[PDB]
Amino acid sequence: GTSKLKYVLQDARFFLIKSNNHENVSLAKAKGVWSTLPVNEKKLNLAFRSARSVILIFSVRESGKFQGFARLSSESHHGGSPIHWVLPAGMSAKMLGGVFKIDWICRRELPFTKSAHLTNPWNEHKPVKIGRDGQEIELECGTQLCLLFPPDESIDLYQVIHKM
Ligand SMILES: CNc1nc(Cl)nc2c1ncn2CC(=O)Nc1ccccc1
């Protein structure tokens, strides 16, 4: 059902993650980690302390879709296992140097055509698919966007809830 999902999404904050390639979203799904530019890293660290849940909604550029969404389970931490991100042009491993741990809530795709009815007040009420990496999505829009994804019945939200 959708009852545990709705409980996880209660009073969450939502951020749009735009990845340049599929490899890094694949790596993030396998290892439960994400990294972003320092300006977004600062915003996510602030948000993590302020809300019961911080939700990352992933979209690979040019794919026409979202590739799933995940919950921050920590602030960014430096050092540790060194993620072999595939770096876009102009990206260095230092720009992507802060590493967050994430718990996946849905690993399924959602095509942009299914979200055309949702607009984001925090981006001039443009459709929610439009936004730069790190764009915050307002509560109601973000909640409805997450509810549009196909259910991912491989994930048990019980352990996710046992972290909030
Ligand atoms: C693992 N993390 C990421 N992996 C990928 Cl592939 N793209 C990402 C990631 N975090 C943000 N973006 C979008 C982005 O900032 N692109 C970019 C900006 C400026 C110069 C070059 C490329």
Curated annotation (Swiss-Prot):
Record's protein name: YTH domain-containing protein 1
Lineage: Eukaryota, Metazoa, Chordata, Craniata, Vertebrata
Effect caused by changing residue 24 to D: Abolished binding to N6-methyladenosine (m6A)-containing RNAs
Protein residues bound to RNA: 18-20, 34-35, 85, 133
Chain ranges of the YTH domain: 12-149
Domain topic, free-text comment: The YTH domain mediates RNA-binding.
Residues of the full protein shown: 345 to 507 of 727
Effect of residue 68 to I: Abolishes RNA-binding and ability to influence alternative splice site selection
Subcellular localization, as worded in the UniProt entry: Nucleus; Nucleus speckle
General function of this protein: Regulator of alternative splicing that specifically recognizes and binds N6-methyladenosine (m6A)-containing RNAs. M6A is a modification present at internal sites of mRNAs and some non-coding RNAs and plays a role in the efficiency of mRNA splicing, processing and stability. Acts as a key regulator of exon-inclusion or exon-skipping during alternative splicing via interaction with mRNA splicing factors SRSF3 and SRSF10.
Free-text description of this protein's post-translational modifications in UniProt: Tyrosine phosphorylated.
Outcome recorded upon mutating residue 19 to A: Does not affect ability to influence alternative splice site selection
Oligomeric form and interacting partners: Interacts with SRSF1. Interacts with SRSF2. Interacts with SRSF3. Interacts with SRSF7. Interacts with SRSF10. Interacts with CPSF6. Interacts with KHDRBS1/SAM68. Interacts with TRA2B. Interacts with KHDRBS3. Interacts with EMD. Interacts with RBMX. Interacts with ZCCHC8.
Modified residues (Phosphoserine): 81, 92
Entry superkingdom: Eukaryota
